[PDB]
């Protein structure tokens, strides 16, 4: 465990982390995708060898000795906005378990179904307090990743609002 377990935010290429393992913003078919996703198959493509795992879920697969957690939102084009919530819960709760099972002491994670998974809704509030309620309770250092300056402005207060 961290000695002071903490959440962070930067605003930088989750391919960049300075954490123990990484959480990819993952397609059910293992597939390189576009975003995050594209970003992680450059960095890691070794770890995506058999990575395919239903929505909701999370499969992790070592790149050397390097972890990544592949973890797949729901797309908010395909759900209805009650299922689509209920997936992307479960999902979070899929990587808090993988996080606890690998001794991690630090962990890079994305904001699941914020981007193309949307279907072009701000889902900021909803993704980060998702990633709250499985997170809490491990105490693993979670840095967060974005790359818009008023989405790390927003993250940035949620975080300092709770401590
Ligand atoms: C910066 C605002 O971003 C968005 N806003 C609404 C819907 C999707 C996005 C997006 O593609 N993100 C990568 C988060
Ligand atoms: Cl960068
Ligand atoms: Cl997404
Ligand atoms: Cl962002």
């Not at 954490?19 to 975003?35: F, I, K, M, S, T």
């Not at 499969?59 to 009650?82: D, L, Q, R, W």
Request: charged letters at 25%; glycine letters at 8%.
């Amino acid at each position: 465990g961290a000695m002071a377990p903490s959440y962070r935010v930067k605003r930088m290429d989750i391919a960049k982390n300075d954490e123990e393992c990484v959480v990819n913003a993952a397609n059910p078919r293992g597939l390189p995708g576009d975003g995050v996703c594209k970003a992680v198959y450059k960095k890691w493509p070794e770890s995506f060898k058999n990575s395919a795992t239903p929505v909701g879920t999370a499969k992790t697969v070592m790149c050397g000795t390097y972890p990544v957690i592949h973890a797949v939102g729901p797309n908010f084009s395909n759900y209805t906005e009650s299922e689509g919530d209920r997936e992307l819960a479960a999902a979070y709760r899929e990587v808090a378990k993988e996080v606890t099972r690998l001794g991690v002491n630090s962990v890079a994670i994305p904001l699941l179904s914020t981007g193309v998974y949307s279907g072009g809704k701000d889902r900021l509030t909803q993704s980060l307090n998702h990633l709250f309620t499985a997170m809490d309770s491990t105490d693993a250092d979670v840095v967060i990743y974005c790359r818009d300056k008023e989405w790390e402005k927003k993250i940035s207060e949620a975080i300092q609002m709770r401590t």
